[PDB]
Amino acid sequence: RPESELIRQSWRVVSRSPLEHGTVLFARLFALEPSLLPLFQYNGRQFSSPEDSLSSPEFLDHIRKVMLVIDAAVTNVEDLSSLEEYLTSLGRKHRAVGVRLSSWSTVGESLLYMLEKSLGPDFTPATRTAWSRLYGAVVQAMSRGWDG
Ligand code: HEM
């Protein structure tokens, strides 16, 4: 595949400042779906507003965790199945936190938003398509975490 290098090359820019870029992702996420804000429970309390989350060291640590998992997916873009068991457990964890299957689509849109804003003219339709495919594979693995 050639869209693997598309992924690697587009990730390079954002991966140098992962907290700054992940902050865009989460600000976008809460703008689109405010009901995700209460899922964070640090110190047994709920954030009132999205800007409250940005003041929380624990919340910012989670942004770094998110960006590191995406980095693992990019690293293994030609061979994701290697992350399947890890992602299944990560999905199970998030289901327990309260994330629902539908919310992963909003996370996906927030990731694409953050890439679009960072890459500008370099966010080509092929780049969008490559990322949608990679993210979709990640969500498919995480969704194995759920049970029916
Ligand atoms: C609606 C979206 C999300 C919500 C509400 C959410 C919430 C949480 C919460 C409450 C925790 C436990 C506290 C913590 O460790 O900070 C957690 C852990 C974690 N999250 Fe998320 N998260 C979301 C999205 C993501 C995404 C997209 C990723 C990676 C692609 C991710 C990766 C992780 C990791 C690696 C942990 C630590 C898991 C562990 O304990 O082993 N999260 N998340």
From Swiss-Prot:
Q: Keyword set for this entry?
A: Cytoplasm, Disulfide bond, Heme, Iron, Metal-binding, Mitochondrion, Oxidoreductase, Phosphoprotein
* Top-level taxon of origin: Eukaryota
SUPFAM superfamilies attached here?
Globin-like
Which InterPro entries does the annotation name?
Answer: Globin (IPR000971), Globin-like_OT (IPR050532), Globin-like_sf (IPR009050), Globin/Proto (IPR012292)
User: What's a BP term from Gene Ontology annotated to this protein?
Assistant: oxygen transport
User: What does the entry list as the binding residues for heme b?
Assistant: 62, 94
Span of domain Globin: 1-147
Q: List the disulfide bonds.
A: none
Hey, what tissues is this thing expressed in? Predominantly expressed in brain.
Q: Which GO terms describe its molecular function?
A: GDP-dissociation inhibitor activity; heme binding; metal ion binding; nitrite reductase activity; oxygen binding; oxygen carrier activity
Q: Where in the cell is it found?
A: Cytoplasm, Cytosol; Mitochondrion matrix
- Stated induction or repression of this protein's expression: Up-regulated upon oxygen-glucose deprivation.
Please name the PROSITE patterns in this protein's record.
GLOBIN (PS01033)
Q: How does it assemble?
A: Monomer. Homodimer and homotetramer; disulfide-linked. Mainly monomeric but also detected as part of homodimers and homotetramers. Interacts with 14-3-3 proteins; regulates the phosphorylation of NGB. Could interact (ferrous form) with G-alpha(i) proteins (GTP-bound form).
The UniProt entry, under PANTHER family, shows: BLR2807 PROTEIN, NEUROGLOBIN
The similarity annotation says: Belongs to the globin family.
| Its biological purpose | Monomeric globin with a bis-histidyl six-coordinate heme-iron atom through which it can bind dioxygen, carbon monoxide and nitric oxide. Could help transport oxygen and increase its availability to the metabolically active neuronal tissues, though its low quantity in tissues as well as its high affinity for dioxygen, which may limit its oxygen-releasing ability, argue against it. The ferrous/deoxygenated form exhibits a nitrite reductase activity and it could produce nitric oxide which in turn inhibits cellular respiration in response to hypoxia.
Q: What is this protein called?
A: Neuroglobin
Q: What organism does the UniProt record list as the source?
A: Mus musculus
